[PDB]
């Protein structure tokens, strides 16, 4: 379901670090990617206080329907898009809100 600007697919942590840096290193600047160490899930790469932190997003299945969580299942989301739109308004476990989408160059 993901054709969103903030989704960069299979890219590295080092690449995400460069992409975020290249785009400004502003607080709230973020992207989502596939985890290299965990191919099952995804990583939210978030910029806060000029540093880039990485948050693992793990999938799970109940009743045959997929859902995602960043807090060991304590907070669940139907899709990554819901996870993103939600953390644009709510802090959750993040140090700041998701403010700016990090896109690839034009």
């Amino acid at each position: 379901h993901r054709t969103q600007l903030w989704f960069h697919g299979r890219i590295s942590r080092e690449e995400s670090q460069r992409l975020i840096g290249q785009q400004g290193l502003v607080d709230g600047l973020f992207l989502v990617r596939e985890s290299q160490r965990n191919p099952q899930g995804f990583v939210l790469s978030l910029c806060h206080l000029q540093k880039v932190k990485h948050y693992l997003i793990l999938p799970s299945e109940e009743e045959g329907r997929l859902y995602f969580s960043m807090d060991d299942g304590q907070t669940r989301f139907t899709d990554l898009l819901q996870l993103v739109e939600f953390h644009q308004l709510n802090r959750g476990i993040l140090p700041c809100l998701l403010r700016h989408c990090c896109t690839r160059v034009a």
């Binding site: 978030l46 693992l56 807090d71 060991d72």
Partner: peptide, 7 residues
């Protein structure tokens, strides 16, 4: 390992 949410 290297995640801010200890995973």
């Amino acid at each position: 390992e290297g995640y801010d949410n200890s995973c």
